[PDB]
Amino acid sequence: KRKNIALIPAAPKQYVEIGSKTVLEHVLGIFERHEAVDLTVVVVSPEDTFADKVQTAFPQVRVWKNGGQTRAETVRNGVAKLLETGLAAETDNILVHDAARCCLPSEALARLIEQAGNAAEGGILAVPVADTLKRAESGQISATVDRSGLWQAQTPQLFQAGLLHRALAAGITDEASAVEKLGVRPLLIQGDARNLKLTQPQDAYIVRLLLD
Amino acid sequence: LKRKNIALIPAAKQYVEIGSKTVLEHVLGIFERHEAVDLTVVVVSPEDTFADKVQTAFPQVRVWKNGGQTRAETVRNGVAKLLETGLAAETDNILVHDAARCCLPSEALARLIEQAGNAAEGGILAVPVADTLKRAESGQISATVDRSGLWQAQTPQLFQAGLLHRALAALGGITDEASAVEKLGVRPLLIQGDARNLKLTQPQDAYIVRLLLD
């Protein structure tokens, strides 16, 4: 009865060509082949050209053109529509995922759903900070900051639809940060080193190699 | 007579076969082929035996067997012995590198030598923290911590032999070499590292390491 719905804000090329497809197409395939995800939605801007062809290659994915002006606004429109549309109940789970984390391992997606799927507080994938951290002033170190109990967040970020809608309605960064402001403490679930984000050539070399 | 650049690798796993060489042999390979490095030393435990084999593949590398009971103690002994021996002068540079960071880009090494190699305060390779940071209480988020201006330290960490010997000799609640230098009131430079300069500590890493070398 309870569903798990993937939502991807994509309204900066997710249309870069690696292997035989785009980054986005590489992303949607990981969700489409996962048995535990019941539906995948992509929110693009009303002027996104390549979007129509993406829809054609993935007819069961809903490609919506109600992107806003910010990543925050485009996520807000996506969640609101799933609810108004009736496609998701207030108690179904929404997994918000970055369009550029196109190497997420299916086994880590399973962990996320298996461990935060039935928790009222939801959960995100994350990896413990393993290196010493430093604060910089103008190219110099002004201090060493304790890395005790610190984690770096990845995506997806899984939360009940009703809970997420409330939190995004109210200095926010990720979705968990808006959930934390309501008094809820989300779980931290082991992400993966392979789950990196495409935001620069160094990353790209590693992604391009992982996608082989 | 120019100021010298000496690599020091505390290695008392790094013997995980990859291709046709151990991780260690891969690491020695990066320094021995780099024009600006004048010497390379590896400090192992006296019990270590595979180290003898390493010595035969790298005749100019110095394999010392005065490892400590911890990484901090082995770095301390290597630096002391480099000075006591006369191989390093007080003002030569000591580049302290992890035995398991076998994918350090040659270009990254050059930048460190060029920028920190000529600054009395030394410097380290490091990358800015790009993802949102969270503090955990018992598997749950207890806070989001501000990442503005924050960096993750890598190796090598480059300091003058006399400044490094001084800083590691005696409070004690420190972590990397930079943090012992900072306690003296000195601020090391931060030089851009690289995403491939990762350390081999778990299977996820090994897959990426093996993949990056081919």
Check if A138 contacts B (Cβ < 8 Å): no
Residue of B130, B178, B196 lying closest to A206 (CB–CB): B196
Answer whether B187 sits within 8 Å of A141, measured CB to CB: yes
Search chain A and give the residue with CA nearest B119: A140
Token pair listed for B81? 């012995």
Q: Where are the alpha helices (DSSP H) in A8-144?
A: 23-32, 51-57, 71-85, 106-116
Nearest to B99 by CA among B21, B193, B214, B199: B199
Q: Is B116 on the interface with A (CB under 8 A)?
A: no
DSSP 3-state of A93: strand
A1-212: in CATH 2.60.120.260? no
Tokens of B154: 């890598």
- Contacts of residues A64-73 at CB distance under 8 Å and 24 or more positions apart, as own/partner, are A67/A9, A67/A10, A67/A11, A67/A43, A68/A11, A71/A9, A72/A168, A72/A172
d(CA B148, CA B104): 26
B88, B4 contact by CB (below 8 A): yes
B178 and A144 within 8 Å at the Cβ level: the answer is yes
Helix (H) or strand (E) holding A179, with range, is helix A175-180
User: A179 with A163: CB under 8 angstroms?
Assistant: yes
Could you confirm whether domain B1-214 is CATH 3.90.550.10? Answer: yes
Report chain A residues whose CB lies below 8 A from the CB of B139: 187-188
Which chain A residues touch B144 with a CB distance below 8 Å?
A: 173-174, 176-177, 180
CA separation for the pair B143, A150 (Å, rounded): 9
Closest CA to A8 of A125, A80, A141, A99: A99
Q: Is the dihedral of CA B53, B56, B61, B66 positive or negative?
A: positive
Alpha-carbon distance of B23 to B30, in angstroms, equals 11
Token code pair at residue A209: 């190699």
